[PDB]
Amino acid sequence: KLKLDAYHLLEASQSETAAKSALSDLNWFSDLADIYSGQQTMAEMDVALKAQGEQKLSYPIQGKNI
Amino acid sequence: FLDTFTVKATEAQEIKTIVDKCHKGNTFDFHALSDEELRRLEQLYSTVNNRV
């Protein structure tokens, strides 16, 4: 096993298409992107619950308010 | 001047008497009870607030 690890490192050094890292297929960047977008949207739409109380308005209307 | 920096009473009256109160009374609850012209009411919103 030790010899094989050495040999693998050596042939990776000799080859050009060698992996830039000894890590396996990473597949958890999608979930990170999804939760980021989710938190962003959840903040954006937990804002406008507070910023749109909208008690009443005062519209100027011709003939009455003027 | 006032027609350009204020809303017109005809535009008001139209929806006030034909659109809004025909939905419901005591609170004017919701809006599924309406025709497609709700979209026109929305357009009216985007005129009124964007002139006022």
TrEMBL record, chain A:
Tell me where on the tree of life, at the top rank, the source sits.
Answer: Eukaryota
Q: What is the official name of this protein in its record?
A: Uncharacterized protein
Counting on the full-length protein, the chain here runs from 68 to 133 of 134
UniProtKB/TrEMBL annotation, chain B:
Source taxon at top rank: Eukaryota
UniProt name for this protein: Uncharacterized protein
Taxonomic placement = Eukaryota, Sar, Alveolata, Apicomplexa, Conoidasida
